[PDB]
Amino acid sequence: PVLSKDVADIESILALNPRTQSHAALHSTLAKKLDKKHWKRNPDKNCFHCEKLENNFDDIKHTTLGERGALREAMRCLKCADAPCQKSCPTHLDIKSFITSISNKNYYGAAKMIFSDNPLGLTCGMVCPTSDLCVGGCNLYATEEGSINIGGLQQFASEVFKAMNIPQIRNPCLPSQEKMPEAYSAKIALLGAGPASISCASFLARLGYSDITIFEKQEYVGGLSTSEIPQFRLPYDVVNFEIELMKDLGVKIICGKSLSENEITLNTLKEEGYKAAFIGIGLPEPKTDDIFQGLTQDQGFYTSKDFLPLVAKSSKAGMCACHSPLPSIRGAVIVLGAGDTAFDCATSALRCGARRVFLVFRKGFVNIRAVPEEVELAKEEKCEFLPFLSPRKVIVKGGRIVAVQFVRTEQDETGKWNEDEDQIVHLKADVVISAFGSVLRDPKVKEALSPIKFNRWDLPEVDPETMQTSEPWVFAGGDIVGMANTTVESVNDGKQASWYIHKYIQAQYGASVSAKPELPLFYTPVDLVDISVEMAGLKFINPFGLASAAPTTSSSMIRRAFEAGWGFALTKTFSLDKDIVTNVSPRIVRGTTSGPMYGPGQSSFLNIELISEKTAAYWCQSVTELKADFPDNIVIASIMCSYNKNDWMELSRKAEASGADALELNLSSPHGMGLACGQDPELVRNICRWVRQAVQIPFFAKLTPNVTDIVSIARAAKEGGADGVTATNTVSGLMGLKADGTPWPAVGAGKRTTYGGVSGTAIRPIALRAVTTIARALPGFPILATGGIDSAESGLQFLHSGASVLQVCSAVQNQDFTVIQDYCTGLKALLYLKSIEELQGWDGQSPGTESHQKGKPVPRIAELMGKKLPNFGPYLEQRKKIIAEEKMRLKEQNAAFPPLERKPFIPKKPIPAIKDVIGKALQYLGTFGELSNIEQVVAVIDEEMCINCGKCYMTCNDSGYQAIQFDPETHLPTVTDTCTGCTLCLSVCPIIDCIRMVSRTTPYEPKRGLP
Amino acid sequence: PVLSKDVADIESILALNPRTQSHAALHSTLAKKLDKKHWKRNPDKNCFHCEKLENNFDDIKHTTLGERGALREAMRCLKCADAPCQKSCPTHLDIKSFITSISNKNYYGAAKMIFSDNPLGLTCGMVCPTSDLCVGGCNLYATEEGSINIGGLQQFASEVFKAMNIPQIRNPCLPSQEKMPEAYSAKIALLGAGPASISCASFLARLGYSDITIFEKQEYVGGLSTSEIPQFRLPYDVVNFEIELMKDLGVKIICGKSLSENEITLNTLKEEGYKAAFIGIGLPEPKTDDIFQGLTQDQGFYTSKDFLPLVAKSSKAGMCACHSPLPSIRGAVIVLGAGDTAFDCATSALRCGARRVFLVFRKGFVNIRAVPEEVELAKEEKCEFLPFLSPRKVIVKGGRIVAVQFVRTEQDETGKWNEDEDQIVHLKADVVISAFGSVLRDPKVKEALSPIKFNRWDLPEVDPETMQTSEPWVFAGGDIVGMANTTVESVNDGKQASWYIHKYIQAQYGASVSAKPELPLFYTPVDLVDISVEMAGLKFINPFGLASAAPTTSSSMIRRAFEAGWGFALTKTFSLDKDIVTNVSPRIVRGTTSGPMYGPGQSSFLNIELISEKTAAYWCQSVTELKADFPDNIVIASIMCSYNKNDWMELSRKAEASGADALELNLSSPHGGMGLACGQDPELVRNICRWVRQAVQIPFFAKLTPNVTDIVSIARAAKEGGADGVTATNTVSGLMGLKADGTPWPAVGAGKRTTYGGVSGTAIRPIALRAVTTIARALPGFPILATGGIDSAESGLQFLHSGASVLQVCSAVQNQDFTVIQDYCTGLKALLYLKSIEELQGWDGQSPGTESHQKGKPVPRIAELMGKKLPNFGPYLEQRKKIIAEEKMRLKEQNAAFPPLERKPFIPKKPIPAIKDVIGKALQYLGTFGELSNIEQVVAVIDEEMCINCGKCYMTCNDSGYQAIQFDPETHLPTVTDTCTGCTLCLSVCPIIDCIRMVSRTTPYEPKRGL
Ligand SMILES: Cc1c[nH]c(=O)[nH]c1=O
Ligand SMILES: Cc1c[nH]c(=O)[nH]c1=O
């Protein structure tokens, strides 16, 4: 037969494989109109019908992210200096840092940074109106692809931390409880268990106060996060999670107790010995209108304070003891108002069975208070909008509402608003929900706050800097003060008050506090993990250090790196005066190793830099100064001489005398098998011998990867007396040419260049091979790793490969010295998680991937699965039909009485130290002959995760075994039995873990070419 | 002094540098509220107040892209199989292919693909309602980051092509015009010079028809693209560009005669000897309403058909000889309707000076059918929206409209719309514009179409597949047929018609046409460029070939690659029967070299694959069949033996006898400072080449490994042994990474074992490029076949410039499919063609010089706007808007300047370089470090108008450089100071291409010695 020709059944497999076209394509406009419907993904502008949402409380947030989407967006963030997003965040979250942590896969460190400044970090990630806050200042708004999804990233990192089930711990910088001064036992009262008081109590507990009580009127906690924000924006289990974190700090909550004249008052708190009080009761009553006087819910009238708590109580499992039904909202619903509550009333009314929802407001579209995020949810769910209408009267017939009369409004010459009595609208309605806002009106509650001063907005008056009322022991914040318009601002109000409550209480006990307010961070048991390591008789407080490179150009830079937390640092390589050099410019350029992607996260750099231009006297004086000031931080002096015994001996002794803990020998010098000393084992052995005879401190040989066998050079260094090797220096390369042939870097008028050194993540596979091969050949010989280390996650790969410490250059060039805090918290988390048996199915900090579309979990419904319903076109309609019917079956098949007491996971094995993980990977490395060819695998695709791109199919067709069927109608792939398990399809799929490799169960025959 | 500390002025420079935080930050809610306005980038929700737009016709499209943004978005596209976006494009554009070309920087190839199926490809890129077309089907809608900006990408590639100023050429597949059959001289008439006729005439001219005339009623051409679509969405020079492309094919346009009685009729056309006619006159008249009878423009009334051409004539330079005054539209403007025209009237009215615009429509918001893109523009410019109002009276006093009276509208149960006479609105207004649609209604125009059949909507009937009317020689398309609602569907109507006009005319002359419609592609002189090359006596039709790898697993795949256009291919390496191998699985994994980015454009792969599992008998028979079927495509047999003379001679003779054009010796076989493999030892390579040279007479090439100290010594030994060239290079040995539990990937068997693998792809391109350059400089003229990260025409040309003659590809096909060859070939043709064009020297290949821009739109060149430290946020942005608006007004009150350049194509001034002409031309720039000038230093300089204020340059200079950048605390604008050393890190990390540039240093230079 013709061996080079596909047989008919493979030709059939290949039907949808791309082919080069020779002509333009003929398709009529009518046929194109009909075919469009089959592939449609987004909403249809001609669709006017609301799709059925009765009893559907699934997440509708557009900002929710899964891990795949979160990694992409975190990598996109510029991680800006003095970032304007943080300036625009009311709690001043270090967004730069927590997004950096997410991009490095350090979800713990991200969450810790979030909760350090915002104890309701998950709630806020979900509900913050970011377009009017952090995102509104994001620099990437100045790009076509637009601003960063900061809230979704905050939500993702916080959701992972939640799933870790790690508790908050008492501030570890505090003295033991025993030894705390008496002032910290002062009895503190907080009124209302909403965002403001939860924040305030949390920060007070961080400061060490041990007697903190929140008194809550209702039987549920969380405030408006619980009672009014819909479950389809903020799941109730988020609120519970954040309350439990605060309770870890000892805060007490007592429900069923009210600030009111016949219960708790300021006077009764004083009588009972309370020393300070925080008022955080919000705005508990609806703003009402005479037009609705006497109307009952049974007639069809609600305020938002009546309606939204009913929906919350029904839809939020564990909010109440009583299971309760969803309000029977049938027919046409009129929502009055255009604030943000109005849009939650409209979307919630659809969940209660509304046939039609009209949002009617008394000003125009350009006057809507609502953030666009909030408006869009109502728009996409087909609520109707009626502007310029002021309500005049509700029509009641047969005991129920049947219509609302309105008068038109308009804006005149001044700008101020008139009503037009002659221009009426009679709007039919079965239900009316007023969303006019909220107030504090209850005279009993107001009198319980005697004698604090109220302002003309009729709210407690506070100093906006201290949150103190006119009574010095009473503070207030959140909605009740009338500035905060958001959860995060109410959180910040409690945070602000906490410092000044602390100051007031301390002064009452005769103690002063710092002139600069200084609140503690958020802490968990992860932060107590020991990440120190000893290597070559040297103690490293953590394994991360600055490589000898541009980040160590000046010793003042090393000083700042030590102040940031870096465990050790190399000097830039320096030499004797005779060997003075002069750099050229340009000399450091970005890598082209991952295409025309600019900005953060360059996959490599190339440099034609020389050794340090600063003198040996500068570096030796600097080493003395750094070791004087930072005795616990390791300083390694990097030195270079030509192939001359007397020179190496003189320079090494000079660096030793300066106080260096160790030396690093840079073997890049040309000599008299490559042109460099480091490429010849005999020269390396001699250089190490000369230094070993000259000094008594340890020294390490820095190996080049540009050699046939780096184990040869490493053994030469050991034979010469080196105490270890640094693996590796940069890979020799040329990073590319402009289209006119000239290079980059191009030096001088001649536009000349020379071969440079490639650094960064593009050389990590080369460095990782070098470290592992040296570690297997020379067991126990200390290795300092360098080559693309840019995270705790990747640092741990080099530790597992045999290195003891981790040098970094390019990751700092891509960012700044503060990445050390990400690396340290990330490594602590990785080691801590190894002790948690309940998380053993995770890959480091990553939860096992389950079925999702757009990071939202696929509903596991019998009638959604197995049956070839992709997420587009008519298949998507059928999917939505199936989900809707199952929500209705869910409305009766009704349960909410098996929640889950949230108890943290406890380590059930010792937490490994660094020395316990070094080299653990080497057991899996060997020769090719040690790999099983009997245990073969095949690919299997999770159809529910697939996004129908066909990349697996095209890679198997033109780089594989033509083993994947690609359906022409559903665009769903299926791996057939001809799969060889090569794993290319998995490697190109855009969805993490959509494709998995599983043990082959059918007989396996290698394809030998037989007909 | 303390050398390791920053002096005072450096400490202040470092003021905004990121530092690690040990405490939570205290910032009051009130202070946060006041600071938020300073940084604000996006629209303020509280802004009731549209900024001023009078006489401002600058681009407002949200989809416009510059090069930086286009490359990012094109790399994001999954480049899907059987792509649904193409299914959803009415002209069936190969979106996958043209976006692939953009990602590979081949803007010519992308434009050629666009214009092959859409002769108005630039217009459609700007105006297509993609959310209802191609983008509505995009698979990436199923990700959080969302669908691809297809239209903006189409616009960008077409804009670059426009700037190339290259003409369209006659279809080069046609015989010369002297020897075309008589039928192609048939006189063809088209009526109306809009998108439908322009498309129809273009495709007819592509087919070879030489007598094609478009008869246009007006003095201007382009149809609605000219007369009504606003300049701030579609610049007139786009329309002119596409018209001139069509005139390149010989289509004639005659303005001033109409299809109408007493003018042109179907009867006059027939009598004058026209053989076919296409009706593309659109809907030339406004849909009227009796309530507007007698109202005049002087009173303030317009239909859309009166208003929008008035604005076009004034704002589009080159439409008229008349410098037209913009309609003075002061006061309140009421636009009636909510179709897409209504929104263009609203935005255009602002440009005329309207103070407020109301969009008033008779149904609800759910019932608006305008695409969301178009609604968003009116919404963001603060137009008001009034639903459920039907106009009843226009009130005129003092000779001017002063108000419009409406009645409320309402739906029933039946869904039947009613008007409530008792519910009235009296809206004050100075101008009324009706946007009720367009119609064909002039009795003499319809009478000129006698006797074709019209339908119940008074439109000509066509067969929807052929576009033929009831008269066989008359065809129709576009708006006039009533099916197209878009420019692209109108283009498609003309495209569809062109084939059946062709079929009809050919039949009239007694000739048949193929049953499969075959419209020709779009061609330019670039497509005639020769990209063949000769090497080692072998003739390659193009320099691109498949490497010996997974894309050549089977000879059936090589066959399909040749059919796609690949110039050559390697077999997978094969061996004698006794050397049979068995692969393990998994064995090919994605690279980790550019972080957790999944899907397209993987920056590397790692493989632990062996040689072919298929027999030498399979491969030799396959080579015979491939060479019999594709004699002009080069087939190179890759072979491997152990270090054995008899084996190498036997296998190489077997492959030679099969008809292989050449052999490639895989030097990966183990044997025994010269490692394990034969390719790492020059003595072994020399002997192997000696053996093969004795055995065969065809050329052979030694495939070098990069895993060697000195690859030149290996290449020299191969040449001494008799090889005719070398292939540089094989994969780089590496370990791609470990999971957090220490297990490797790939992991084989239950033991999860691995071995060192080979790294391929763009991550190893700097290594391969250094290898090719160093061999080319040491062994000038010795043929080099390059392999290692070649993924585009421009990377291919880097390797040619470096001394290679042909270009092997693997990973780029694994990342995609075989059809990338068409991108590579057109891209290489374009790169060589542009080298002959003097007017484009300043480009870098296909990339224009970057002008100052924000979000890809050029910054206004205004004096008071330059150098005034006004970044694009907060109060500075408001000042920029004032300055821009002010001299839009000064450009108004002086109404001169109507000189739109007449478009002439650039002409090559020297011959087009052939492949052999460019080989090695980069080597002149390579040298030793000592040959680099250290006198000619550079410094960095920042273009503040392109800056997006991220501080990355600042952060990198601070912690990886010389603390030489000032970063302003209020404007977040950086300035390079005189302590710059030209190191070039800041440029290397800046997210904006060419925002930072290196320039010659003009101030005295001293190296920093620290001392
Ligand atoms: C001195 C030096 C400069 N650049 C590098 O990449 N490595 C080195 O050792
Ligand atoms: C046989 C072979 C497999 N994989 C590679 O990367 N190179 C080779 O030569």
Ligand code: SF4
């Ligand atoms: S022509 Fe229009 S519909 Fe087709 S791909 Fe381009 S933008 Fe999309």
